[PDB]
Amino acid sequence: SYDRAITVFSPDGHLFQVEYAQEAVKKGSTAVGVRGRDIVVLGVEKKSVAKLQDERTVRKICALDDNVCMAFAGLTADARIVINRARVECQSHRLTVEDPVTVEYITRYIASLKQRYTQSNGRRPFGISALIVGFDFDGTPRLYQTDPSGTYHAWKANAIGRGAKSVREFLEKNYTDEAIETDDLTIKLVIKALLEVVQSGGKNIELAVMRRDQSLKILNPEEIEKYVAEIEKEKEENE
Amino acid sequence: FNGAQCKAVCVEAGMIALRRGATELTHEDYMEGILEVQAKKKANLQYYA
Amino acid sequence: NQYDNDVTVWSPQGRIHQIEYAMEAVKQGSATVGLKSKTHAVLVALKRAQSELAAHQKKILHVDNHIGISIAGLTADARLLCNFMRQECLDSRFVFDRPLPVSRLVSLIGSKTQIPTQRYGRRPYGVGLLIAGYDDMGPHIFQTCPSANYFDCRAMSIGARSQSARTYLERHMSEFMECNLNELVKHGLRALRETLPAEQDLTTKNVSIGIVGKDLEFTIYDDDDVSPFLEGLEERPQ
Amino acid sequence: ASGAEVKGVCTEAGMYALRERRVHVTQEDFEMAVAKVMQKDSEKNMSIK
Amino acid sequence: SAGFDRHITIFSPEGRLYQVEYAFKAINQGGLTSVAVRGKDCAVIVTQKKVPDKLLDSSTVTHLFKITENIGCVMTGMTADSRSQVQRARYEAANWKYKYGYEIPVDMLCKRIADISQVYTQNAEMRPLGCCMILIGIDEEQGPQVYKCDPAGYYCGFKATAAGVKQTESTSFLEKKVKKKFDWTFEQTVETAITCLSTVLSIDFKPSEIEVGVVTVENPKFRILTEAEIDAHLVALAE
Amino acid sequence: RYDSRTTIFSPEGRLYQVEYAMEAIGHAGTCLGILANDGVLLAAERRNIHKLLDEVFFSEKIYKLNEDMACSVAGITSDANVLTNELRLIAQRYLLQYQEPIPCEQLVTALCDIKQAYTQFGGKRPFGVSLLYIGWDKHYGFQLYQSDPSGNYGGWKATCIGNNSAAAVSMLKQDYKEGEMTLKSALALAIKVLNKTMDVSKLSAEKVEIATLTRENGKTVIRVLKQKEVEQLIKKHEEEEAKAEREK
Amino acid sequence: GYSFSLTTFSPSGKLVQIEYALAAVAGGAPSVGIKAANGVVLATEKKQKSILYDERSVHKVEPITKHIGLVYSGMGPDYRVLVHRARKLAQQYYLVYQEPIPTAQLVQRVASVMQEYTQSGGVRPFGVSLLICGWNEGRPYLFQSDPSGAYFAWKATAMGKNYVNGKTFLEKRYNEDLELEDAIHTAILTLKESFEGQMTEDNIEVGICNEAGFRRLTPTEVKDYLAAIA
Amino acid sequence: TGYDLSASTFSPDGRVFQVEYAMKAVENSSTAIGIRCKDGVVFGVEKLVLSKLYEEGSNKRLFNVDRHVGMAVAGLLADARSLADIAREEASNFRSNFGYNIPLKHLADRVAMYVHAYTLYSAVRPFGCSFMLGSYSVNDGAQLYMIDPSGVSYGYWGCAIGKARQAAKTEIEKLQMKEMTCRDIVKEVAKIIYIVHDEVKDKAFELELSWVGELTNGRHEIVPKDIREEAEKYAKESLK
Amino acid sequence: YDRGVNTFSPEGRLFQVEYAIEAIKLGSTAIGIQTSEGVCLAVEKRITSPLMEPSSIEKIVEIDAHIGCAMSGLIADAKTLIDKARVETQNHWFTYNETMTVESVTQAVSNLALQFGEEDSRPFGVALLFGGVDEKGPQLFHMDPSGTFVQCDARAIGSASEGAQSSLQEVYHKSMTLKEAIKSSLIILKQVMEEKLNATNIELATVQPGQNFHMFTKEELEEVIKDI
Q1: Keyword Transmembrane, does the record have it (chain I)?
Q2: Contact assessment for residue E78 and residue E32, using Cβ atoms and an 8 Å cutoff
Q3: Which residue from A150, E82, G115, I211 has the least number of CB within 10 angstroms?
C-alpha cells in the first residue's frame, strides 16, 4: 500500500506502478496497425516536424528481421533499448533453429523480458507497448501487442497512444469482413484510420507497409494526398 | 477474565436460562454465558493448514 | 510502537516482539498432541479443510524410517524444514551409515533457525514441530519454537486451544508410561477430543495417528487403521 | 540587484557622504555602497554548472 | 542545526558532522584518566583502575597493553573497542615485521591505525570505534616518542600527553608545568606524572590503583611496574 | 509527494529526475552549432571569467574526441569528464575492432544507452549533462546532434541549450538560413546570437570560445581558433551594427 | 529535510551534500599558493591548539614526487588517504611510462578518484580541497581541486578562513611576474593578513617548487626569512 | 531514546542503547552463579520447571565446550547455543593448529571479539546472553571468566548472572574461597542457590551443578549430585 | 504498516499473502469438477473487443499429455509457473521414463510458489487448478498463492466464487456422470457471467483415462451449449 514501491500489493489487490506505467503509454503518440489478408500495413501519427532539423532519426517504426515490423508508444528510450535487445534476440534465434523468426516467439521474449524486468528489485518498468506485425507461416498475417505488465495479446487491428478508445472505436465501425485482399481497400482502410486520427493534419501522417514477402516500404506525401482526395470524394458521394 | 467478565457470565447465564424461562439456573446456562463472554471471535483461520 | 517492526531491533524492555508475534502465528495452527511410552512414541494431529468437497490438509508427514514430525504454523517453512530434515537424515545416512540420534538433529534445526532470527532480511520461521524418534536410549518427543529453544518433554501439545490437552497430560502423565500402544493412542485422542468444542464429535476424516516403535517403523495412518483406533471410546461426560 | 537594493545603495552613499561631514555624494560613496550591497552574493569554488 | 537528526555520517549545515564528535565523549563514558610524559630518554605512562570489588581480580584489569616488545600502549573509553583496536595493532605490527624485515617504528603504526579508523569513518554502516589509544616507544636516532590516536583518525604526538575524562585540567596543569625548561631525569618524570594525576584527582592514594607503564633508553623493552617499586616511588615523592 | 528516488514513477506517468536534470542543465554554459556545409562550428560561453586563471588548457568545453569529432558540454562538470573518457574509450574500441572511424550515430546511441542505464537502474544519479556533437562520416557528411539526460537524442541543424538559449533558438528560427555554406556568415550569425543572448556588454573576446571543423583533402581537421580573428570578428560584427544604425 | 542523500537531485538547484562539504572546506585552515614566473610557492597556517604539540610530526606541505608539491585546506585524515592514493597512482604511471607523471595527468586521475567518491550513495565525499603544483616542462603549474571532483588553474589563490579577503589582497598585491623570493614574501604577507599575529618558524610551513625540483623548506631558512620579512 | 534504533548510531550523550537493551534483557533470565576454589571451578544454575511439562534433564544451560571448558549460560537460550557452537569451533581450530589445549584467556578474547563484532554492525543485533567460562590446568590452575553482552571479558573469583546478581554476591564474598576444596564449595553453591527465591514469585526450581578441577583430572562434567546429595540435606538445615 | 514481507502482524500473519488472496478476486472465474469418469473443467474468457481474437487468450494450457491447468489472476506469474511446470514434468519423464503424477506436479510448483525473497522476489498473484489422471484415476487439484495445496472435488475460483461454491454444493454429489457435470458447470457459469453464453465465451477441457489425448472441446461445445 502506496504508489511506492513496485513490490507490495494494494490492500484491495492491485499494483500501483503496473497500473500507473500504462498512463505514460496512454499519454503517448498514436500508432495504429491492421492486418490485411496478404499485405499488412501500419503507421504512426504526430510526426511534428519543428522546421529546423531532420526527422530521419525519430522513426518510430522499424524492424528486427525482414519478416517482422515494429511500433510502440510511451517514452522513446525504453523502446530504443527493447528493440536493440530484440534485434540481438532475433539474431540469436537465427543463430539457433534456422527458421525465419515467428512473431509469437519474439513477442513471448519481449513480454517475458519486460515482466521479469518488472518483478526484480527496484527496476523502473519499460513504459511502452509494442506492436509486432508479421506474416510468417505461409504468409499468415499476425499482429500482437504488448503491455507494461508484459502480456502479449493478439488482435486483428490495433490503436494506442492518445485517444485510443475513439481510434479503436472507428475500427469497430469500419472493420467489416470484406476488408482484404482487396489490397486497395486495405490501403484506403489505413487512409481512413489516418483521417480518423486525433488530429489528422494531413502532412504529419507517416505510414509503412509490408506485403508479407517484400521489405518495409515508406510511402510518399503525394500518394497520401491522393488518398485524402479520394476519401473526401467518397465523403462527397455520401452526400 | 476480570470480575466484570465473570459478572457478565452470571447475568447472561441468567437470561440464557430465561430463554427457556421456566426454571432456575443450569450448568449449560453458565456454559453459554461463557461462550458469549469468551470471544473476541477468531475463526480467521487461513495459511496454518 | 515504532520499534516493533523488525527482528534486529531490541525493545527498550528487551523483549523481541517479532518472536512473540511468531509465537502467536504458531498458536493459530491445528491441534496436535505428542506423547510417548517407554517403548512407543505416538503423535496425533487434527486435520481441517477449506470446504466440504475439499480434502483435508495433512499435518503428520513422513521424514525418515525412525523419525516423523508434526507441524503447526506456516506451510512453506514447513516443507522447507522438511527438505532440510530429510537432507540431514540422508547425509549422515550416507556418511556414517547409521540412523541419527535425534538430539543432534534437533540441535541442527535450532542452529538452522537461529540465523533467520538474528540477521535482517529473513523472517523467523512459524513452526510447530513435534518430533518422535528412536536413538539407542529409546523414544524422544521434542518440540520446537520460532525462538529455536527446542524443548524435550514426555507429553506436549501445541496449536489452538491446546490448554485443555495440557491439563489432560498433567492428569495422565503418571499413567502414560506403562501402558501398551492401544490405550496410549486412545489417551492421545482423549486429549484431542478436548481440543474441540463439545457440540461436535471427532470423526474419521479429520484425524491422523503416527506410531513409531523401538521395533516399529514410522507409519502414518488415515481412517483405515484409524477406524480400528476410533473404536474403544466412550462419549464425553455431558 | 533588486529594486529596493539600489535605493539602499543611494541612501547609504548619502550616509558615506555624511560620515565625511558632507552633503554631496561623489562616486566613491557609490564605490563603497556597491561593496556594501555586494555581500549578497560572492563565494566561488562553486563553478560547477 | 540538527535538525537533520544526525543519524548516519553525512554533512550537516555549517558545516560539521555530529557522529564523530559524539564519539569524542565515548571516551568520556569510560570514567578513566590517562597521562603520558616524555621529557628525556625515558617515557612514562600512568593510569588508575576503578575496582570497587573484592570478588574481582587485579591482574586482568590492566589497561596497559603490550603491543610489541618495544611498543606498549594504554587504553580508555569502552573496553571492547579498545581490545579490538589492540588486536588490530598487534596484527598489523606483525604484518610489518613479516613484510619489511625489521621492527616497526611507532609512528607508522599510528598512521595505520588512523587509516583504519578513517576507513571505518569514510564508509558508513559500521560503528566508528569509540576508544582513544595512546602509544609510547623508543626509536633509534630520535629518542623516545609519545603518540595519541583518535577515534576520529587524527593521530598526533608530543611531549606531555593525556586523554580520558578529566584532561582539560591535566593539559592545563601540564601547560603550567612544562613551560619551565628543567631536565627530566626519570624520577622527575615519575614525580610529575604521579603529582599531576594527584592534583587532577586529589586523592593521594595507595600504590594499588595506578598502573605505570615505562620505557627507557637503557632497555628498550616495554616494562610494567611492580607494587613494591610503585610504593618506593610514591614514598620517594612523599614530602 | 512521490519524490524520493529516481525510480519509480510519479503517478501521471511523469518523471522527477529527468525534469530536474533539465532544470539542472538550464543554469550552465550556452553553446551552439550552425547549419553549414563544407564545415561546421561550435560556440561556447566562458564561465568564471575571473582574472587569476591561466587558460593554458586551450579548451574548456570543447573536447576533440576521436579525430574528426568534438563535443561541447553543459552541466555538472566532473560528470562530463567521466563521460568523455568513456566515450573516447568507446570510439577507440570501435576503431580497434574495425579499423574504421566511428560513423557517429552508433556512438551517440551508445552514450545515450550509457546515460539511460542509469536512468532505469536504482538508486543512481542520472547524468545531469546535455552535450553537443559535431562530426563527419562516410555516409552523411557534416552532422549535428543533441544529447539529453533522458537518453533521447536529437539530430538538429541549429541546436538548443537552456534558459540562456531559448532566445537563441528563437533568433535561430526568425533568422533561419539555408543554402549558404559560407562559414564566415554563420560565424557572424553566431556572433550576433551571443551578442544578444549573452549579457556581456560589447562582447569581450575573453568571454567567448569558438571551435570549427573543416574537411581538408583527407584529414577532417578540427580548428580551435585563436583570439585575434575573434577580435576582428567582433570588429566586423560591430561594423555591421554601424550598418544597422545606418537607418537612423 | 531533503538531500538526503546522494541519489537524487534537488527540486531545482544543486547537490546539498556537496555544498555542505564545500562549507566544511571553507571552514578549514587558511592557506595560499602563488604561481610565479620561475616557481610556485605553497604555504600554510598551522597553529597548535596547546603548547604541548610537536611540529616535527605532522606535515602539511607534502611531496607527491620529487617535483610535485601539494597542500590542502580541510580534514587531515581524508587528506592522507587521497595523498596515499596519489602516491600509488603516480607510481603506477612511473611503472607504465618510466617517466615522471605530469601534474595535469595527476589532476585528471585524482579528480576522477574524488568524483568516484561523490558517486552515489553510500560514502560521504571528502572534506578536502587541494592545491597541486609542480615545475613540469619548464612552465610551472598550479591546480586547485575541490570535493566535487572539479579542478581549476590559478595564478594565485587561497583556501580557508577569510579566503575572500586573501583573494582581494592577492588580486591587489600580486601580479604576473615575480621571483620565487618575492612570491615567498607576498605569500607570507597574505598568510599573516588573516592569521593570528603570533607567527614563528613553526606556525607556518612552506614548500616551494623550483625547476630544480620540489623543495620543502626548513624552520632554519624559515626563521632566516620570516624574521620580520617586512 | 529514539535514537535507540540501530546498533551503529550513537546517542547525543554518547552511548549505545542497543547494547544497554541487550544487557538488561539477561536481567530477567534465571539466576546463574559461579565460584572457584584453590584447585577447581564450580558452576551452579537456578533452573526452573515451567509447570508440569518439563522432564528434568532437558535443555541444560550447563554446556560443555571443550574437554576442560564448559559454559554456564543465562539469557536467550538459542543464542547461547549458537555462541557455544562458535566456542566449540574455535577450540577445535586451536587444537588443530597448535596440538594442545586452548588457554582460557585466548579463548575468551576470541569469543569477546566475536561478541564485539556482533555489536558493531547494524544488520545484526547484539547478543542476549551472559555466561561463564571455567577451566582447570595443571600448569595454569583455575581461571574463571565472565562475558557481558557487550564484549567486556575479564576474570573473577566469583560471579552471579540473573535476577539476584547483587543479592548473591552479597554473600558470595563472605565465603572463605582460597582455603577450601571444591567439594565443600559444592554444598556452598547449593546453599547460595537455595537461599535466593525459595517460593516467592514462582513455584518450583531445580538445581544443576557443573564441576571442573583437580579432582576430575582436567575433566569438566556435571557432578553426580544425587551422589552424596549435598543440597537438600543441607537445604532443610539452611532454612533455620 | 504491514509494509513488507518481513514483518508479522500482532495477531498473525501476512498481510502480503492476504493481499495476494485479495488479488485472486479480480480475475475471471473458472470451474472444474472431478468425476471418476474423468475431470471436466471450464472457464470464462471475458472478451473485450471483436478485434480480440478469442483462441489467442489462454486459460486451459497443456502441461502433460494427461494434465491440464487453469489460471486465475496475474497472467504472467501464471505463465512463469506454467513454464516451470513444463520444464519439470519433462525432467521427471527424463529421469524416470514415466509420467509425473499431478500431486507431485503440484508439490513441485508449490516448492517455489513461496520461495519469495528479495534478499538472501514478491509472492505470486495467481491461484491454479490442476486436472489430470494418475494411476489412481482422475485427479483434480487446487492450489493457491500461499502454496497451501489441497485436493478439491469441485473447486470454483475467482470472481463470484461464493455463490458458485454454494450452488455447486447444492448440485454436487460423489457419483456424478460426465455430461451431467458438464451442463451443471455451464449452468453455474451462465449464472455467474454477465454476457450471453455462446461459443466464444467459455471453453471446456475434458480428460479421460481412455481418452487421454486432446483435453479440449472445439465447436462441439456449441452443441453442448445449445442443449440447454
Answers
A1: no
A2: no
A3: I211
